[PDB]
Amino acid sequence: LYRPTEEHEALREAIRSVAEDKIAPHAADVDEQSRFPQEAYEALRASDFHAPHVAEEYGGVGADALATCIVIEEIARVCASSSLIPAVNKLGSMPLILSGSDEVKQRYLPELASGEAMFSYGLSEREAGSDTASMRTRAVRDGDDWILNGQKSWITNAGISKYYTVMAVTDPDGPRGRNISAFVVHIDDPGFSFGEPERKLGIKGSPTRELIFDNVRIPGDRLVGKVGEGLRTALRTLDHTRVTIGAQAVGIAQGALDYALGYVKERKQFGKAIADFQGIQFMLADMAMKLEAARQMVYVAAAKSERDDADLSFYGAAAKCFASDVAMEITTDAVQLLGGYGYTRDYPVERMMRDAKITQIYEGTNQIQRVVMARQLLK
Amino acid sequence: LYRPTEEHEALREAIRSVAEDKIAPHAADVDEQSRFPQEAYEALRASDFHAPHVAEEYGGVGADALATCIVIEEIARVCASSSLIPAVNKLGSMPLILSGSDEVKQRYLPELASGEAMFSYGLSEREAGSDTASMRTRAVRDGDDWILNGQKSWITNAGISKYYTVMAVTDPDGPRGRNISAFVVHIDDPGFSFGEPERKLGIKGSPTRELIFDNVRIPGDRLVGKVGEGLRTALRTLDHTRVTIGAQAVGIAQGALDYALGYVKERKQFGKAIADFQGIQFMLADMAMKLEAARQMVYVAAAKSERDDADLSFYGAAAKCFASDVAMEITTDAVQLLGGYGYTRDYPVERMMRDAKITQIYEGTNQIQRVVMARQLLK
Amino acid sequence: LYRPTEEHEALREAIRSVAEDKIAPHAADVDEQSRFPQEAYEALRASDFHAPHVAEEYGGVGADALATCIVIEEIARVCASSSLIPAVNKLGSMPLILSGSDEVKQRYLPELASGEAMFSYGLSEREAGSDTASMRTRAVRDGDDWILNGQKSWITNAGISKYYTVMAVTDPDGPRGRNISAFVVHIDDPGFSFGEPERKLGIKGSPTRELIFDNVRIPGDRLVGKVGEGLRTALRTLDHTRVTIGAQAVGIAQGALDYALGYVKERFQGIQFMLADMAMKLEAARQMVYVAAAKSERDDADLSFYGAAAKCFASDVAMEITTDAVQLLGGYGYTRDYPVERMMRDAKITQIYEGTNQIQRVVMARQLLK
Amino acid sequence: DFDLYRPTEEHEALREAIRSVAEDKIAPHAADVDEQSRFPQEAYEALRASDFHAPHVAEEYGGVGADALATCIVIEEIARVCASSSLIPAVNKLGSMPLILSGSDEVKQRYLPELASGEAMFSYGLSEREAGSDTASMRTRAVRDGDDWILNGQKSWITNAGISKYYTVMAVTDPNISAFVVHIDDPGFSFGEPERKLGIKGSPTRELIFDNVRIPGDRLVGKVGEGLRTALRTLDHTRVTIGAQAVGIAQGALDYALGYVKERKQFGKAIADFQGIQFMLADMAMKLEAARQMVYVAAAKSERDDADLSFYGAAAKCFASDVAMEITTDAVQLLGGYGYTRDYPVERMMRDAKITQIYEGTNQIQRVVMARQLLK
């Protein structure tokens, strides 16, 4: 009751030690250079932790939603950019799971579950970032095939994901929400290009790239879901990926709190370990307490996500909004807690603050989460 | 997972229905003339919700600790004062459960479980509230009986509860925290008097009285647990009722967010429903998100209060501190959202605000909670 | 420079003694029985702080807006209900000052300034509370007079004020906000009655009653500036009384923190940090109110913004501080035996009346995106 | 017409002055300053050309002698566009305060003209590895070698170091402490490796290491053994400059935020027609302006050196810094994905803001000073 199965905890100790071993040192370096955490990718893949959400049918680990966030958490605790790997894979493969045809699922999800390829997910566009219902990217038919044209931006793991679940308008004059569909674009696919990797505040490692569609023709079997169903797919994909982002935020903050506690037990200003100043003790109390509320809520919403509960819209958004807020609130405090040392790149709290910010921004800025929560409350 | 069981959800639905009609309408009156929730206690007892935690063995409903919290929540949601009936009942009976001898337990718990008698719990002392190992209340052993002297303060439901698990030193030189034992005082015991009931900011209904012991002869069977081990028992009980006060805070806040939501959809300023202004929407979003986190952590800590988990103290402190703090923010916003109306007692939210304040204060002020947490963090 | 003139501080020691000595002990009762701060009113009157804003021209104290705010603060420091007397007097006289012809100013301001009469201000309406530009209290001209029919609500200090600058729409047609004018209704004036005093969370002392107008025959000399300007005048006065509500909040917070600090001396670093946050927020709120108050007196361009900005922040701060004040005093802080309970309840309203901090944030936003 | 609670008209002329100096000369370089972690040299050149390298220096010594509001306003209006660039007047006042507050007319004369002219920059060595905040327990020793002194030890966290010219470092004489202008060229005086910082990446934060640095006896600043009464004063007076730094960073962030939200449209309406973004900008502007005004009250209070200058100083830095963080965070939030990228400054202003909360007495230390000034 109100706890992960102890199974989840064995899973956690696993992914935790994978994170402590193969991710952490590489996290500091990943961030500095803003290059992909490849070591993280081969270590997650080597431990079959790269995309544990995939079903058993395709060779996945079959992770529970709570189990899936646990992985994303335990990674973000040490490296936010790497933490995106199973998180972006769940995000980009979710339209393919929740609505994909059996043939398309069997095509694509086994290569992920195996580790051949990572997914990215192209929904946002620069002239309609949060207003995903009124996008510009275009899927016109051409024979059996599909021509995509247009813009996707803020696409995570771009350049590295092989597969890109794009959402493009199929019938530009139908009832909003029924004119958009999802198509798995490959890196192969001619005319599909990437934009410059963005110069990011945090997640500097995991590339956030614009991806351009210049008459990208693609077979008909890469339609995922039916036609027009792309927004009804994207909504349930948000519904489920919000909680992954919540867990990522919880994780970023957890790593920050861990360095905070360690540093306060080691260092001694005014003769004593700063850990024992009641001020700092209050600060750690708020950090730990907020973090634990955010954790429990992302976990509740994950329970809401595998059980596919009714109010998953609300709690998912809320868990994402709060966890991210908490992450900022905590990681900033963590930086504050290490004083001068904290704003040094030698210690991870700096990176962790820079990293936590996107949890408040990307996958729908928490203002959108508040819009969603409000619309859900007025029912 | 992260589900109150269908058992609990039905239980929730039950106690909610009892709160709505049988308790809520009286809530304004209970608070106003600062009177005990007689209607509420009556209705809870007739419905087995007055102290549902009590063991089956002694005729209680055998309520899960989570379920107990759920009841205190749903009661508090409409009337905070009334929720102390099950809350202070769990508080006062818990030392009698956690350490009580089979006999004394079977003496008192039936009286409670049926609804004949109420419990209060005397541990804190006017002088050194948080340094409980240094309490002045002594019980001197005299024959089989004891003679009590001392000063419990801040003791909720006094004057109205009949049996009082008071904690007294039984060694002015015995060892710290092992020099104290627990005694069930009756409302009948000579020399046992109450102070004038405190004039409280909120929870005005439930009486907060001083406890005076003037050479109170109490029989020898009133000892619960060993002599000396009462402190360990008291600290464990603290760990467990922390979470029920947390649930109460969540409840007070839930009432605020409910009445606010209602008032917001219907009432109109500038001619569209004020819930159309995205600002009020953000505010309501934050209220709901904070509140839901506070709720989920109250529930997690309730689970840990059943399993007697290690970090039960930490998670309970966190649940109380967060639920209460969050409640304060929310009920304050609740007053805000109803504007001029919310400032009047015609609407309850103002009362709910006064009530959230005490949850930040009694049952271990959130500062003390933050200390407890910071202490578990610095293991 | 960036400090009260030494005579503002001379004014502070004066009203501080008046508040600590004459207002403070009764404040607890003022709140307890939810009755008017009579002791406070007669003592503020005895000390010329019941309405020090009035020009000396009418026998007032001639206080600059900064001074008015400081008075309101030193009163709110001990009694918010009491702190509203000078505050609601400046509020109710402000339309009467800012635009009234010297006729009505000379008829009203001396009787206020001296302390015969208190003012309240009828702008807020239940139906169109936040949208004051679309209010529904009607006043049609009957010969030289006007007739009033309508319903002002949440009129603070309403039960006891004599003179009431109530603002009514005179011409429904035309641009709402340019069709509103203000007229001072008397307590004895025929047909004008009050509702039942609101049972309030805090400031219970200062009575807020509805104002109902049942065909009140008001003379034509009750005109407060040219017909139709009333909304121009009303947002003009809000511009100034925002800053006084800020000052009130600063005071309420101050009192909360004062009992907090005192209590902390009486009975570790965590509580120190909490007190530091309290005091620091408080002082930012105080300086923000004073910057704005000086900004009002010189009738600066951005008084719209700063009055809002100070009104919101001070009030917000008051709320956390008074809340935190209650927190520091622990169980004792949750009792009416100590005033911090009353002070928290008092501070809440500062976020609400005279434009909810939602409206304050909107007007602020508005000036930001001009 | 009464100028109470408002910065004087001359301060305001100075403001559009320094604002134009920043917009027109500093602003374009801020992005590069942060990206490369290099000293804002162009900014220093235009500040020196415009009497802003340390305008606080007296007119007796050739500065403009600007009052604490004036110097603060410069630090703000500069930080408004580049935090690192704002450290120029800020770190110069920081390093010059011991030399002013207790320095002998000879020692004032040896150095303050080189600053006021714009030749040399000053930095200030008080904090250390072991006892930064506990100034009573440091371990950098000044031994009286003849009339002269031998210095050994390590100051840490020293802004503009390696690049600044004169270093008023403070050492214990008898284990208590005195202040000494160590020169860059002085024998054996070296710097540690510069920190790779979260923000203020332009302004170098370096260790100060001494292996038997001999410095003449006239390098003494103030009283021998009694620099400590000078050190708490330098704090008292310089918090407000770090605060104004915070206000400036914060104001800049709010400026880019407003610009973006008016320029950008979303869901078909401008993103600032959404009341959520509106309240958000309102909270930002009011916190911001409150922190600004308290910075100004504390600056005036550092001018006439009031009794409570400690509290009002600490609070203004602690609040302005905290508010700056709070604002820049929302600023990054407001520009969405665009705000997350370094192509827009809101991100840099956030990192710049995270330090105003930390250095030169972390707001936790600021709160301690406030709590002690409260129980007076």
Side-chain angles (χ1 to χ4, degrees), chain A residues 1-235 237-379, chain B, chain C, chain D:
Chain A
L1 168 45
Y2 263 106
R3 173 151 57 41
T5 60
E6 173 208 322
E7 202 159 62
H8 291 181
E9 297 302 352
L11 160 64
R12 199 203 290 280
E13 296 185 22
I15 175 61
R16 158 93 81 195
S17 43
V18 174
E20 312 266 30
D21 256 27
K22 333 299 174 199
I23 320 278
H26 296 124
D29 184 18
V30 168
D31 197 68
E32 244 282 2
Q33 295 301 124
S34 38
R35 45 91 164 174
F36 185 85
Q38 188 40 102
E39 306 94 350
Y41 178 49
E42 294 159 3
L44 284 153
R45 180 189 186 181
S47 268
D48 211 3
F49 265 127
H50 62 307
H53 73 295
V54 186
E56 283 280 279
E57 319 212 40
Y58 322 126
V61 161
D64 201 13
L66 207 165
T68 315
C69 290
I70 283 164
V71 193
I72 308 163
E73 179 186 314
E74 293 300 337
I75 315 173
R77 159 170 156 162
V78 299
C79 172
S81 339
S82 331
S83 87
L84 282 176
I85 294 166
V88 190
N89 280 351
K90 183 171 176 68
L91 166 62
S93 75
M94 274 299 119
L96 205 151
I97 297 170
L98 316 148
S99 295
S101 72
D102 290 352
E103 298 83 61
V104 84
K105 281 194 284 186
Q106 244 302 333
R107 167 64 181 93
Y108 289 100
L109 289 163
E111 275 194 322
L112 181 51
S114 60
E116 289 195 73
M118 303 165 36
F119 269 72
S120 283
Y121 170 52
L123 169 68
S124 321
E125 310 188 338
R126 101 170 59 195
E127 295 101 328
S130 38
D131 179 7
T132 60
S134 87
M135 46 179 79
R136 233 75 195 198
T137 295
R138 200 205 324 152
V140 279
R141 199 73 71 106
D142 207 14
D144 305 320
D145 297 344
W146 284 98
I147 314 319
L148 272 69
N149 250 330
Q151 186 62 252
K152 285 318 183 196
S153 56
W154 320 115
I155 318 302
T156 324
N157 280 326
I160 291 303
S161 294
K162 263 175 214 265
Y163 297 178
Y164 293 67
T165 316
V166 194
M167 222 77 59
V169 68
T170 43
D171 183 3
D173 63 358
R176 293 182 183 174
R178 284 151 281 271
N179 43 18
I180 187 54
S181 317
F183 311 98
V184 201
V185 166
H186 314 175
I187 319 185
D188 305 303
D189 278 312
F192 175 49
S193 79
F194 308 82
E196 271 193 0
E198 310 274 1
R199 290 190 293 115
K200 314 226 279 292
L201 177 53
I203 305 304
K204 291 184 72 176
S206 181
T208 291
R209 285 169 82 123
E210 185 216 342
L211 50 95
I212 305 136
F213 297 108
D214 174 77
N215 282 304
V216 188
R217 86 160 51 241
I218 60 176
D221 69 2
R222 77 175 54 185
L223 164 88
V224 47
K226 232 3 232 178
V227 192
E229 301 304 302
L231 197 172
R232 293 182 183 174
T233 313
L235 294 178
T237 305
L238 211 58
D239 290 337
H240 294 18
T241 309
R242 287 165 179 157
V243 306
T244 89
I245 288 298
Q248 172 153 18
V250 170
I252 301 173
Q254 176 62 51
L257 186 54
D258 302 343
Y259 273 77
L261 291 169
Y263 181 85
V264 296
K265 289 189 176 77
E266 261 83 348
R267 207 283 200 298
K268 299 185 178 72
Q269 278 172 8
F270 281 110
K272 197 169 191 178
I274 77 161
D276 278 28
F277 283 113
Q278 187 192 50
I280 288 284
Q281 282 168 352
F282 276 9
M283 207 148 325
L284 295 147
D286 278 355
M287 291 170 72
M289 165 176 95
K290 291 173 203 176
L291 178 52
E292 201 67 18
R295 186 178 281 141
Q296 302 316 294
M297 195 133 76
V298 308
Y299 293 176
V300 167
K304 286 270 167 51
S305 176
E306 202 91 47
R307 281 322 161 268
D308 180 11
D309 293 355
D311 43 356
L312 189 171
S313 287
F314 171 94
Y315 283 74
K320 195 268 189 197
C321 185
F322 189 103
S324 45
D325 276 5
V326 166
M328 200 61 241
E329 199 176 357
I330 284 174
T331 46
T332 305
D333 276 10
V335 170
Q336 186 61 11
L337 282 200
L338 306 195
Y341 293 117
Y343 65 90
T344 299
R345 289 165 176 181
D346 302 343
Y347 297 80
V349 293
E350 169 266 351
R351 180 199 74 240
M352 292 200 268
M353 191 177 137
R354 299 200 280 81
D355 285 346
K357 181 61 214 161
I358 26 85
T359 81
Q360 291 172 324
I361 310 195
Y362 84 112
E363 295 302 320
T365 86
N366 293 335
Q367 291 70 54
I368 296 305
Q369 313 301 300
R370 296 192 184 111
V371 194
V372 158
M373 296 159 60
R375 87 217 283 203
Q376 304 294 288
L377 265 73
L378 312 192
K379 293 298 183 178
Chain B
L1 321 183
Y2 291 127
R3 70 210 166 200
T5 84
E6 161 155 339
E7 172 96 350
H8 301 144
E9 283 299 351
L11 176 159
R12 164 180 277 303
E13 299 182 280
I15 187 57
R16 190 184 215 106
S17 301
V18 152
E20 298 296 330
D21 321 310
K22 330 298 179 172
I23 299 172
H26 307 282
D29 180 50
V30 164
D31 184 86
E32 179 60 22
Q33 281 112 9
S34 317
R35 69 177 181 85
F36 187 87
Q38 301 260 64
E39 305 82 344
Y41 175 69
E42 195 101 27
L44 294 188
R45 173 181 183 259
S47 78
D48 285 339
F49 282 113
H50 54 278
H53 72 296
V54 182
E56 321 83 9
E57 162 162 50
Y58 312 97
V61 77
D64 198 20
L66 198 150
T68 306
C69 277
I70 285 278
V71 174
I72 291 121
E73 161 168 341
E74 282 307 349
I75 293 190
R77 182 159 130 278
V78 296
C79 173
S81 310
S82 311
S83 71
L84 287 180
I85 301 155
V88 189
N89 258 337
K90 183 171 211 209
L91 170 67
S93 72
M94 271 295 282
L96 182 75
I97 301 194
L98 283 194
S99 192
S101 90
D102 214 328
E103 302 177 349
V104 79
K105 192 152 57 119
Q106 167 61 56
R107 164 61 174 87
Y108 293 101
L109 293 212
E111 285 273 289
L112 173 69
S114 62
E116 262 285 319
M118 292 194 353
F119 262 61
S120 284
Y121 170 77
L123 163 75
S124 56
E125 299 200 328
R126 187 179 171 276
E127 183 178 2
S130 62
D131 189 16
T132 59
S134 181
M135 56 181 73
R136 57 203 283 180
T137 288
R138 61 201 188 262
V140 293
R141 210 211 264 273
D142 188 32
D144 161 80
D145 318 325
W146 303 75
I147 287 144
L148 250 187
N149 295 286
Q151 193 75 220
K152 300 306 191 186
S153 62
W154 292 132
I155 280 295
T156 180
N157 251 300
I160 293 290
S161 290
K162 191 146 59 83
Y163 315 134
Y164 296 58
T165 311
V166 64
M167 299 295 209
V169 279
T170 54
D171 257 357
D173 39 17
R176 210 160 201 78
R178 283 91 201 83
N179 58 339
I180 293 136
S181 47
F183 304 116
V184 175
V185 172
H186 289 231
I187 211 167
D188 312 320
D189 270 332
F192 167 80
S193 89
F194 311 101
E196 57 77 68
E198 290 280 8
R199 286 189 293 154
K200 304 171 274 276
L201 155 64
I203 212 120
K204 274 162 161 323
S206 158
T208 284
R209 299 171 173 270
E210 199 103 25
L211 293 209
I212 316 288
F213 304 112
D214 182 65
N215 282 300
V216 180
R217 329 212 66 150
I218 50 182
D221 55 340
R222 314 288 189 77
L223 156 64
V224 307
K226 293 179 179 179
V227 154
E229 191 143 34
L231 186 138
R232 178 62 67 188
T233 284
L235 250 175
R236 292 234 301 181
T237 308
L238 194 44
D239 293 11
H240 295 154
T241 60
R242 276 203 261 274
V243 302
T244 84
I245 286 305
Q248 163 165 240
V250 162
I252 304 171
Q254 186 69 70
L257 173 49
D258 290 352
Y259 209 88
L261 269 162
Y263 176 96
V264 182
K265 320 207 264 164
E266 109 203 6
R267 282 298 101 212
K268 319 178 188 221
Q269 292 309 319
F270 285 78
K272 62 177 195 166
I274 70 172
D276 288 354
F277 303 114
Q278 200 191 57
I280 305 274
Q281 288 177 347
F282 280 28
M283 271 196 48
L284 287 158
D286 284 312
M287 306 189 10
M289 181 177 69
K290 298 184 229 117
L291 171 54
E292 278 304 329
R295 170 176 275 131
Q296 310 317 331
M297 208 159 31
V298 156
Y299 298 176
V300 156
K304 291 180 172 275
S305 323
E306 289 267 355
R307 278 106 57 158
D308 210 17
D309 284 22
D311 28 54
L312 195 202
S313 62
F314 168 96
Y315 276 79
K320 189 275 191 194
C321 187
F322 186 72
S324 66
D325 280 3
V326 162
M328 199 66 261
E329 299 180 356
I330 288 149
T331 63
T332 306
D333 287 301
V335 171
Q336 203 57 42
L337 284 176
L338 268 62
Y341 284 108
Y343 211 58
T344 68
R345 325 182 228 161
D346 288 341
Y347 298 78
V349 292
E350 158 270 341
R351 180 207 74 225
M352 310 180 136
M353 166 171 164
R354 292 191 281 99
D355 289 4
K357 184 59 229 173
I358 60 176
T359 57
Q360 298 183 297
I361 297 196
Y362 67 59
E363 176 48 36
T365 50
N366 294 6
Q367 287 69 42
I368 287 304
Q369 308 294 335
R370 280 164 166 102
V371 164
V372 163
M373 300 185 277
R375 190 178 59 235
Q376 303 288 68
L377 271 70
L378 295 192
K379 82 172 192 297
Chain C
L1 191 172
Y2 254 109
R3 96 159 160 195
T5 300
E6 175 181 353
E7 224 54 11
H8 293 77
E9 294 276 13
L11 184 31
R12 201 188 297 260
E13 223 195 1
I15 177 56
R16 184 152 324 179
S17 186
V18 180
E20 303 181 23
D21 173 34
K22 304 288 187 325
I23 303 183
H26 307 102
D29 260 319
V30 163
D31 194 88
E32 184 74 14
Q33 292 95 12
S34 297
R35 48 90 182 169
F36 183 64
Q38 268 269 327
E39 312 97 324
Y41 183 54
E42 281 297 306
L44 291 176
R45 186 157 138 67
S47 149
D48 272 351
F49 298 144
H50 55 241
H53 66 292
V54 198
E56 332 181 55
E57 190 162 335
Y58 312 89
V61 171
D64 60 41
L66 206 67
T68 314
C69 305
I70 299 180
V71 175
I72 301 188
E73 163 162 342
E74 287 294 339
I75 305 180
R77 187 199 165 220
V78 282
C79 184
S81 298
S82 312
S83 65
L84 275 169
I85 277 150
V88 170
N89 284 342
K90 192 188 188 158
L91 170 71
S93 48
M94 266 291 111
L96 242 186
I97 294 163
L98 291 154
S99 67
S101 63
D102 212 13
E103 279 101 51
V104 71
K105 274 175 291 141
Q106 185 83 252
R107 206 262 156 260
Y108 282 109
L109 289 178
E111 176 137 44
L112 172 74
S114 55
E116 304 297 334
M118 273 180 310
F119 282 43
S120 298
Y121 168 66
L123 182 27
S124 327
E125 262 201 337
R126 36 204 334 75
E127 71 209 68
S130 276
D131 197 33
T132 53
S134 67
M135 85 192 77
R136 206 118 194 153
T137 291
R138 176 152 202 77
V140 315
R141 27 185 146 209
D142 162 58
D144 165 43
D145 311 322
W146 308 83
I147 199 72
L148 269 206
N149 290 322
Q151 266 265 20
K152 261 91 181 54
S153 56
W154 284 305
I155 292 318
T156 178
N157 193 10
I160 289 137
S161 295
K162 257 76 160 90
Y163 302 170
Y164 297 57
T165 313
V166 305
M167 291 207 36
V169 47
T170 55
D171 181 47
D173 316 328
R176 291 211 136 271
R178 328 276 175 180
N179 69 342
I180 311 284
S181 54
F183 319 117
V184 50
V185 167
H186 310 232
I187 188 181
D188 57 342
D189 179 315
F192 152 77
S193 68
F194 314 150
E196 298 301 329
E198 298 291 324
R199 287 132 31 100
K200 284 168 301 167
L201 157 59
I203 81 165
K204 326 172 92 74
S206 178
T208 84
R209 301 166 169 257
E210 269 198 344
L211 304 183
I212 60 158
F213 306 111
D214 173 7
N215 281 306
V216 298
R217 200 157 275 131
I218 76 161
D221 68 351
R222 309 277 203 70
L223 203 48
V224 182
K226 57 196 203 168
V227 311
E229 150 197 13
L231 205 45
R232 325 160 91 79
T233 292
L235 45 78
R236 184 145 70 106
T237 75
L238 169 77
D239 280 337
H240 297 87
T241 64
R242 271 161 162 154
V243 200
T244 52
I245 298 310
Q248 178 183 39
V250 170
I252 304 184
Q254 180 66 68
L257 174 73
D258 291 4
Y259 260 86
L261 276 171
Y263 187 94
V264 179
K265 318 178 95 179
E266 318 211 60
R267 283 149 170 100
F268 273 108
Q269 215 190 26
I271 307 307
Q272 276 199 9
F273 274 14
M274 210 158 280
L275 281 151
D277 270 336
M278 254 163 279
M280 168 179 78
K281 283 189 297 186
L282 167 66
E283 202 64 22
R286 161 169 307 111
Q287 318 301 344
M288 189 54 172
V289 189
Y290 299 166
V291 180
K295 238 181 201 283
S296 94
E297 183 120 10
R298 319 188 298 276
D299 194 55
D300 278 290
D302 41 19
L303 179 63
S304 306
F305 171 82
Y306 274 79
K311 197 272 198 192
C312 194
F313 189 88
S315 59
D316 282 344
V317 153
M319 250 296 319
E320 295 153 357
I321 280 177
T322 40
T323 291
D324 288 336
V326 180
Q327 198 61 21
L328 304 153
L329 272 60
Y332 281 135
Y334 82 64
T335 40
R336 332 187 203 156
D337 300 334
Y338 294 75
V340 293
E341 170 263 351
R342 174 200 71 249
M343 319 178 111
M344 194 195 137
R345 298 195 278 85
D346 288 354
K348 174 68 224 170
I349 191 70
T350 69
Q351 289 165 328
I352 303 167
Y353 51 52
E354 288 294 295
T356 44
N357 287 336
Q358 285 65 44
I359 288 166
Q360 306 301 349
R361 287 182 178 86
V362 183
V363 287
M364 250 175 291
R366 293 229 264 249
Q367 319 323 338
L368 300 158
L369 304 85
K370 291 284 230 40
Chain D
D1 215 5
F2 84 111
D3 274 42
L4 279 275
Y5 269 105
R6 169 226 297 177
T8 88
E9 206 165 53
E10 219 278 309
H11 299 156
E12 290 291 326
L14 154 68
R15 197 200 288 280
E16 296 100 11
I18 182 56
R19 186 165 302 214
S20 61
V21 170
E23 322 290 38
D24 313 348
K25 287 298 181 184
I26 311 171
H29 298 256
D32 192 65
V33 185
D34 181 69
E35 188 72 14
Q36 296 190 340
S37 307
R38 37 145 296 211
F39 186 66
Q41 200 93 59
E42 330 85 347
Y44 182 85
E45 289 176 352
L47 266 73
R48 177 179 186 168
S50 306
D51 283 61
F52 298 122
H53 30 283
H56 73 277
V57 200
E59 282 179 301
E60 192 179 17
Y61 306 69
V64 169
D67 56 346
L69 262 67
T71 181
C72 284
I73 288 168
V74 184
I75 285 132
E76 167 194 357
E77 291 297 320
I78 300 170
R80 198 168 149 271
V81 314
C82 176
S84 307
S85 302
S86 70
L87 287 178
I88 288 171
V91 193
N92 289 285
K93 213 205 205 190
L94 173 52
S96 311
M97 280 302 109
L99 263 173
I100 280 171
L101 295 175
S102 74
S104 78
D105 210 84
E106 288 95 346
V107 84
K108 283 178 291 198
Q109 189 60 57
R110 296 184 69 189
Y111 298 121
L112 287 192
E114 277 217 328
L115 177 63
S117 56
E119 319 215 323
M121 298 202 285
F122 276 68
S123 50
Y124 184 72
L126 174 64
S127 307
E128 292 185 353
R129 221 178 275 303
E130 325 300 327
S133 295
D134 190 33
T135 179
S137 299
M138 71 185 38
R139 195 131 290 191
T140 292
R141 315 104 55 207
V143 188
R144 219 184 207 131
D145 173 314
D147 269 324
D148 291 11
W149 304 83
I150 288 284
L151 291 162
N152 278 282
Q154 292 175 334
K155 300 295 181 233
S156 60
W157 296 124
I158 307 296
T159 325
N160 193 21
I163 280 74
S164 178
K165 262 65 184 174
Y166 298 131
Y167 296 66
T168 334
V169 53
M170 254 187 89
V172 62
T173 66
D174 168 76
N176 44 5
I177 50 184
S178 302
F180 291 102
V181 175
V182 170
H183 299 232
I184 175 175
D185 267 301
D186 287 0
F189 171 64
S190 68
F191 309 106
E193 203 67 20
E195 298 299 325
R196 301 170 316 129
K197 296 169 285 167
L198 173 136
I200 318 293
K201 294 165 78 164
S203 189
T205 283
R206 290 170 154 266
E207 262 178 315
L208 292 175
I209 46 185
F210 327 89
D211 61 357
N212 314 344
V213 197
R214 178 177 288 270
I215 57 169
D218 61 12
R219 307 291 178 81
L220 190 291
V221 178
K223 317 93 171 173
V224 306
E226 182 145 297
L228 198 56
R229 187 175 304 162
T230 309
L232 294 103
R233 300 222 316 264
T234 46
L235 278 172
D236 290 341
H237 289 108
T238 48
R239 297 144 187 150
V240 311
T241 182
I242 284 316
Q245 186 174 356
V247 172
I249 287 171
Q251 177 64 68
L254 174 63
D255 289 348
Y256 222 92
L258 288 164
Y260 179 90
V261 312
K262 298 201 289 186
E263 221 173 20
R264 184 160 269 302
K265 172 165 59 27
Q266 194 65 259
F267 288 114
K269 36 149 49 182
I271 79 165
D273 299 346
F274 294 102
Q275 203 175 82
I277 304 303
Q278 283 187 170
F279 284 23
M280 171 157 333
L281 292 169
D283 295 350
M284 306 176 35
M286 85 190 188
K287 299 165 211 183
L288 170 86
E289 201 70 28
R292 162 183 280 169
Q293 297 320 346
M294 203 158 66
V295 156
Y296 290 165
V297 175
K301 299 186 84 151
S302 77
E303 171 76 17
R304 47 156 169 287
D305 195 64
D306 303 15
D308 45 19
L309 174 56
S310 287
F311 171 78
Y312 286 70
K317 193 211 87 70
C318 172
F319 193 75
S321 62
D322 270 351
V323 171
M325 190 68 253
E326 191 144 335
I327 283 166
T328 53
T329 300
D330 286 3
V332 184
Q333 183 68 27
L334 266 185
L335 268 70
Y338 285 106
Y340 200 72
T341 60
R342 263 128 55 200
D343 297 340
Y344 307 70
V346 300
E347 160 274 344
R348 169 202 69 226
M349 297 154 167
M350 176 173 153
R351 295 178 292 104
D352 282 348
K354 187 50 218 169
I355 179 63
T356 83
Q357 290 180 300
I358 291 170
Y359 40 60
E360 309 234 25
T362 66
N363 290 346
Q364 285 53 46
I365 284 302
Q366 291 304 359
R367 283 168 170 87
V368 165
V369 167
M370 291 184 256
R372 311 205 221 91
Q373 282 277 125
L374 251 61
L375 304 163
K376 234 41 173 182

